[PDB]
Amino acid sequence: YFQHMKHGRVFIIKSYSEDDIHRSIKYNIWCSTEHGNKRLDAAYRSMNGKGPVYLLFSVNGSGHFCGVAEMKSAVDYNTCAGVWSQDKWKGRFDVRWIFVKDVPNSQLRHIRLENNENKPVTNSRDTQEVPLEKAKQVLKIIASYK
Ligand SMILES: Cc1n[nH]c2ncnc(N)c12
Numbered sequence: 001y002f003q004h005m006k007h008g009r010v011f012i013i014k015s016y017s018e019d020d021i022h023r024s025i026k027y028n029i030w031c032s033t034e035h036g037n038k039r040l041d042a043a044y045r046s047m048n049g050k051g052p053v054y055l056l057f058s059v060n061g062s063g064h065f066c067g068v069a070e071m072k073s074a075v076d077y078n079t080c081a082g083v084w085s086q087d088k089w090k091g092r093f094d095v096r097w098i099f100v101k102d103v104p105n106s107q108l109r110h111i112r113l114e115n116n117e118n119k120p121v122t123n124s125r126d127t128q129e130v131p132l133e134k135a136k137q138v139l140k141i142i143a144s145y146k
């Protein structure tokens, strides 16, 4: 249960590669775009441990979110090249996967993001930030979905 969360920031991850998500679950690491890496680094560092950064993962075109992971370190920008599905993916940070489970978009699309033109949360791009009150609604639904 994620209702205890008073602080904390939540981002959507949209992957072109399901293989990269499988690698991320296996080794508890992730990376993002050049902009996404800077956005997440800033958010993690500004938290100063006062609350979590959660990542809500979804494979482009799958019609479902596939789980949730907590960001667990700052971004190292200079790391081994070519570990992901494509060479463009640079950098690395630790994550801890909290839920690994498929949740259909139909369960989530009523939740709209006031910072993204009131678009459904299921129509977000990679690294879209989610307002906390809408993030808690998404997390409650992922956690109790069966
Ligand atoms: C890897 C990775 N990090 N962030 C991403 N976003 C879209 N596609 C991907 N393969 C990735």
Ligand SMILES: [Cl-]
Binding pocket: 079, 080, 083, 092
């Ligand atoms: Cl590495």
